Design an enzyme around this catalytic site. Sequence first.
Site: not given
Lengths: 159, 139, 126
Positions: A52-55, A58
Amino acid sequence: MRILMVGLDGAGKTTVLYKLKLGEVITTIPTIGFNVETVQYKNISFTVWDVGGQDRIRSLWRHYYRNTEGVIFVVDSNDRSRIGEAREVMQRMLNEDELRNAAWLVFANKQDLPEAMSAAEITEKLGLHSIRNRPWFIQATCATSGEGLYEGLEWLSNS
Amino acid sequence: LYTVKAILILDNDGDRLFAKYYDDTYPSVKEQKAFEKNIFNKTHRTDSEIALLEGLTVVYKSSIDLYFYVIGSSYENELMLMAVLNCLFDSLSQMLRKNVEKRALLENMEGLFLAVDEIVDGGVILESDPQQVVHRVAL
Amino acid sequence: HLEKSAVLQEARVFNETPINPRKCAHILTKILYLINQGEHLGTTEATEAFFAMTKLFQSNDPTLRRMCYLTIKEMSCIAEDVIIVTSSLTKDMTGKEDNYRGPAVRALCQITDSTMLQAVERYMKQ
């Protein structure tokens, strides 16, 4: 096989994942505190990393390396917005170079009625035909249908 | 109330192989050890009902071959503290069903560690009821 | 009796494909020992560990879980990252027994950021 399923939190990747994996889903937010999951398919033993890639992460999503060999790249099909350009290219290229040692199978999600702008334009834009390169598939899905899922895995379970 | 300034697990031979300094105030690992030298050594192989060093409370269970310690401030209740001192002492004992030795420790190193965390966690005593505990854990 | 440097490389072997729950458990014990008597710590070493520890999580094995907590618990004032953990954390939380849950909070508390807090409050309510 460390197979990385990528995309953001909020995608509803996760939804898919457990839909497949467990049969049943979970919220349209991909994970915040990861997935590592194991699946046997075709009785072959697989590790799913769901992001939930989230920066911040990320940025660090590279964060790990060893034993890498396969990509589900979930991208949301109908995503008219975050999909291409600098971001897309960058991610792809970086990933590619870094782990030229793993097939990249991109997953296009919630296709519903597709709310993209041309299947053709994009695939090209991604340089899908820059191919002369690793086993590739460009694959369509709307999650609810799961418009191409089993092949992805299947075709994959090819050797 | 954060009672364990520190806790130490000690040889007969006046050494410490476990200590978790619940709070440090004179630094280093080192500095703890020098202290041991005085204190343990001096005490060594013999305990007290009460013992003090300078307004601080000195607590601990022994074995013939092994030493247990807790430090707190002598400025407060023997009994509870004892009760505790024991609580540990027993629990482990009971738990072990054995007198720890030098042997005990090597015999299973893990258990100590594990043990160490459960009651007291840096300083205060979370966990207890040793039998309970004992049962409570096993995993 | 035993020594750190070698071990420091070797711990990651559990992280190597290696299946033998015991082996790693032991190795972990030692690390903790090095630590217990007294040990330098630092980031690089940590970071590498950060990727190393992380994969290892299809373990069901409860006791296996225990071990983890402890280690993590070790990192607190010198702690590194939380987001990964979130999911993990969540896992203790939804996690059946009660048990799992307590360890996690316990590392968390010297270390963390305002922010998340809100969320985790709910858990607190519970």
